[PDB]
Amino acid sequence: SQAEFDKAAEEVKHLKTKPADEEMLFIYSHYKQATVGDINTERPGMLDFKGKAKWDAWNELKGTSKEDAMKAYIDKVEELKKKYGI
């Protein structure tokens, strides 16, 4: 569901506690994979360490269908909702 995806995208922004780095990268990469699809941008330069990490995470999902990405995204948000509370 696209409606379910939009909801999760909003709720994830209001978690009582901010997710761990690993969890944020999972969220970022699946969000991109579900909306844009296969990565279509240039990898950031040497000094942009945070940007390179996010780019690599999304790159790793290449080939994943938007449907599967959406499902994994929503499932993770529900997981984070129960873990950190909202």
50 is in an annotated binding site: yes
13 is in an annotated binding site: yes
84 is in an annotated binding site: no
* Cα distances (angstroms) measured from residue 37 to each of 43, 46, 61: 16, 25, 9
Tell me, what DSSP letter sits at residue 47?
T
Q: Which two tokens stand for residue 83?
A: 């873990």
Measured CA to CA, the distance from residue 65 to residue 34 in angstroms comes to 7
52 is in an annotated binding site: no
76 is in an annotated binding site: no
30 is in an annotated binding site: yes
28 is in an annotated binding site: yes
CA-based angle 57:30:71, to the nearest 5? 145
Would you list which residues are annotated within the binding site for an acyl-CoA? 13, 28-32, 50, 54, 73
Would you list which residues are annotated within the binding site? 13, 28-32, 50, 54, 73
